[PDB]
């Protein structure tokens, strides 16, 4: 299924520890057992372990309209064989 939402490219977890680990974005109602099987179904690889964390909403536009940014769920997978999950 389309569990993965977007890939993340930053200073940390991308260009540093990115040749062996990959940082993705998922929906906020999924566990790492589905994230593990969904990666192997799209890229034909073997995953070693998956680590997932949560983030709280963050305020934005200090001033007239003071709203909140959407929450996100970050995942980090590690492969034993294969590579090139992104380009």
């Amino acid at each position: 299924r389309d569990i993965l939402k977007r890939p993340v490219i930053t200073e940390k977890s991308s260009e540093a520890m990115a040749e062996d680990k990959y940082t993705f974005d998922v929906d906020t109602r999924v566990n790492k057992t589905q994230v593990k099987m969904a990666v192997e179904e799209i890229f034909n690889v073997k995953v070693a372990s998956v680590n997932i964390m949560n983030y709280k909403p963050k305020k934005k536009r200090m001033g007239r309209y003071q709203g909140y940014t959407n929450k996100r769920r970050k995942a980090i997978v590690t492969l034993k064989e294969g590579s090139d999950d992104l380009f």
């Binding site: 939402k5 977007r6 890939p7 490219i9 992104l86 380009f87």
Partner: peptide, 8 residues
């Protein structure tokens, strides 16, 4: 595939 090419 179009959503990946938009993010990068």
């Amino acid at each position: 595939n179009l959503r990946f090419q938009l993010a990068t």
